Design a protein around this ligand. Sequence first.
Ligand SMILES: *[C@@H]1O[C@H](CO)[C@@H](O)[C@H](O)[C@H]1NC(C)=O
Length: 123
Amino acid sequence: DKTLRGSFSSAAARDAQGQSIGHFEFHGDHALLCVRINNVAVAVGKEAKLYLFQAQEWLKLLESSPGYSCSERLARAQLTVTVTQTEHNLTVSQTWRVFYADKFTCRSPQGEEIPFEMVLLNP
Ligand SMILES: *[C@@H]1O[C@H](CO)[C@@H](O)[C@H](O)[C@H]1NC(C)=O
């Protein structure tokens, strides 16, 4: 299992073409990633989204020449969630890597960062 607290940042996401939140590995066919936020209106206003990549697929994208554009690489995520509620549970079926992006990432006042808590459960 894993627990992480932090904040989703438009600046961090724009800087790296997706803000890297974390990574995880698990044994078995399914795991549950639970994401909690309080500021839903700010997330909806930014079109906040999470992108999950299988780290082997993500590495293949980064090793491609010339390389994918910001939007094309995020469109190749294995799983996504559009952040519209205080909690979203993602069933991850099969290392995995999690990224945050919003309407400013692949392009206006960018507002403030969105605090979050993420819990990963392996069953
Ligand atoms: C996420 O999973 C937890 C644990 O089963 C549950 O308590 C919670 O209600 C779920 N939330 C949503 C939005 O499905």
